[PDB]
């Protein structure tokens, strides 16, 4: 009938798919490239910017930007390009037909959620959506109602203790160490 889209914006990899299948059928880096060299050959079909695996393939000639840094979306037009690419190119699904479920790290600014929702309703016209905490979903994934989740992606690391399905919001710890600054 209608099945929600499930999308986790992360930093680095985007991974997206349909609710109730078991692994994401779109996975690609959340990266946008713009060409920086003078183009010489006339009539090449040269393109203003590249997204995801395109920008990985051509990365020799591109400046690569990450639109998400430490779970905060710093650049919004590139994030809209990444979602447009996800829905139309990767999933080939029109977003008006499906609820969308979106994932976020705890303790990050509220403006990030307000903008994510304003964009999903106004530009995509998604009929319904929700924003979920990254750590909470790892318990659903591991079959538990209790535990202290330690989560680290690119960017933010956070601990979230949960006990029989109640979060303990005064005990949430967040750390900016993980993943990109290991590479730097």
């Amino acid at each position: 009938e209608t099945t929600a889209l499930v999308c986790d914006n992360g930093s680095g990899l985007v991974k997206a798919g349909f609710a109730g299948d078991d692994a994401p059928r779109a996975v690609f880096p959340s990266i946008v490239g713009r060409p920086r060299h003078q183009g010489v050959m006339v009539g090449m079909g040269q393109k203003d910017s590249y997204v995801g695996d395109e920008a990985q393939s051509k990365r020799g000639i591109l400046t690569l930007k990450y639109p998400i840094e430490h779970g905060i979306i710093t650049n919004w037009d590139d994030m809209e390009k990444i979602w447009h690419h996800t829905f139309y190119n990767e999933l080939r699904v029109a977003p008006e037909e499906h609820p969308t479920l979106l994932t976020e790290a705890p303790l990050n600014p509220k403006a990030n959620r307000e903008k994510m929702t304003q964009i999903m309703f106004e530009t995509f016209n998604v009929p319904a959506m929700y924003v979920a905490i990254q750590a909470v979903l790892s318990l659903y994934a591991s079959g538990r109602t209790t535990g202290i989740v330690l989560d680290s992606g690119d960017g933010v690391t956070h601990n979230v203790p949960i006990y029989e399905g109640y979060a303990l919001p005064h005990a949430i710890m967040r750390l900016d160490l993980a993943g990109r600054d290991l590479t730097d």
């Binding site: 109730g20 692994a23 059928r25 318990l139 659903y140 591991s142 079959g143 109602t145």
Partner: protein, 747 residues
Amino acid sequence: ELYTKYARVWIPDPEEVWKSAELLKDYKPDKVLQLRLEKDLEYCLDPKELPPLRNPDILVGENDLTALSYLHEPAVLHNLKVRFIDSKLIYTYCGIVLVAINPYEQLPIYGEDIINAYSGQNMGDMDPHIFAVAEEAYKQMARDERNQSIIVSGESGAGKTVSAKYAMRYFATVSGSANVEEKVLASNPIMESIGNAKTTRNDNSSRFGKYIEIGFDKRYRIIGANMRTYLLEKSRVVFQAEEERNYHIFYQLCASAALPEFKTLRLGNANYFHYTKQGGSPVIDGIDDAKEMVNTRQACTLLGISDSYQMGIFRILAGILHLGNVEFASRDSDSCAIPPKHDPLTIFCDLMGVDYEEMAHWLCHRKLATATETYIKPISKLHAINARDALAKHIYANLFNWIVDHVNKALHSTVKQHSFIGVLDIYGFETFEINSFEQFCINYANEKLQQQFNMHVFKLEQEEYMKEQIPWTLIDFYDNQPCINLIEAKMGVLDLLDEECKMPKGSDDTWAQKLYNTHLNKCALFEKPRLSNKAFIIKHFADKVEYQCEGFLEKNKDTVYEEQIKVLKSSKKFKLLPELFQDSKEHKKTVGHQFRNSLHLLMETLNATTPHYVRCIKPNDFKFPFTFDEKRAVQQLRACGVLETIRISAAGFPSRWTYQEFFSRYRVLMKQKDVLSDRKQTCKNVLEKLILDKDKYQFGKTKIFFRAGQVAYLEKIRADKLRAACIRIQKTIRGWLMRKKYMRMRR
């Protein structure tokens, strides 16, 4: 009032559900009734009810229970009891429905002279008989090409198979003949072997709906038959309650194990294997499963399943049995392993032609693949057991669909089917001291069939009201849609159950808690049992039924890992095992969702068609010929919805009279002043005097329509008038004769 001296009433009694009593002093508004019994009694009249009044004897015994003026449980039970015991009639109409009572005796009524007597006759013409339903379906099919169904419902042992047999014998006789009926009757032993199980109340209960389509050519010759099946009870293959068995075939197979052919299977006695062992009761009294095996193989031969395929089938079933013995040791909270050199798994792999190391690996691990990348990861002993039992259930369901398709290959014929008449044998509403996921599915299927019945009857009433030009508004529809939306809507009991299956740390206590949350006080049909927090009550059409939650999560889980199927698909030892699968989301579907889908396929098959209903009832448990038990029958009339059908007809205009026969009956009331030669206007004049309320009857074009009470009230006042006239005349005669003897006394 109606309660006068010499009235009669039904009073409740412990040992037969109702007994007759005569009202020994007329009632006035208050608390007392003096009653006399066929001796002397006084009965408390108490909240409020008056005791059910009794029909005048002219109505008792008539061929149609809706001809009764008072419609209520004891009048129905009395008319069936008198027709069966005294007349030895076994068939009785209720409205559209034919009620059929199992005589446990042979009868002459199925002779071909009677077949011919029924042919071409409409239901009004002749006393009810199953041929009178078959002939109606046949002529409905002739008039209009629309296919016809015949639907047969009741507890197993009520004679549904013999009813279908004579129903198709009718078609064979009227069309002439193509040897369908022999093949169809020869198929019954295998379908009963694979599809029937002992149950706490009943041996040879059928756990699936069987639909036989008899196809006709443009001549309405019998071409041939096609067989479908629905609503199979898959969960029984792996779990049974106490005093229940697995499907008969498993015990026929185990008992055969000593035979030379089956030696290679290494079968044991039936309480060795985990799936047969659980029920407690390996041996049915009065059946030799080893002998039944012979009839099963014989019917396989007659339908032309080669003995190669027969040994394939028994191989696969011994596979399922040996698989059930596979036992997992948990090496961690999240990992398990099969103990080394495991004899059950060694025999299962030998039987099935698979590499021991691949089954031993895939039983304990499951595989997930992202589009670029695949991870193998362990699973707990609980998920391993749930997946082994889902594999056994999936093998069994595919073997069942295969045996059904090889029967269909034997029954089909090459002539293109112009149209068909189809016969549905299905279980009726079910209630035991313990009620469980099986009973919940059965009662939901019966709620669906009862809705489609009520809506067909409502359609036919709107047609008859058009035919008599009576306003439609007088009849109201009685809709069990709220109970269906209770069971199957989103946030329904099945929906919350399928949620709680995937939910982490789901359990029958938290499922029950979600039930009480969503529906404890929002729906009138859902109730919590007073003393328990583990059970729930649904008010079904027939009765309130209390279900225990404690089983449903184990029974509801199916998930089949693709790698375990692909191991079996890889088998080359024998050809049947890869043939079964030959055929992705369905592997994720729960048993409840597969059931709801098979039920939607069934409702699509039936809604396409025009139904005719037969209800079968089983008058006594002990199979005594032509004995009747009121407390058994009231249970089965309730479960067959006959009593609710009658309740729904008792509101409205159940009693209908032709003006001719009405006038003939009640000339005695009419004064010779007001008898016109037009009967209809006389009747319209008279009934308004005799009955005050125009609401209580309607003047149709050709028939008078009465509400329930009125015809018995007219019969009462008629009888009292005729009593007064008789007494007055006979006192005059006696007076003359004594005056003559006085004339002698002067002389």
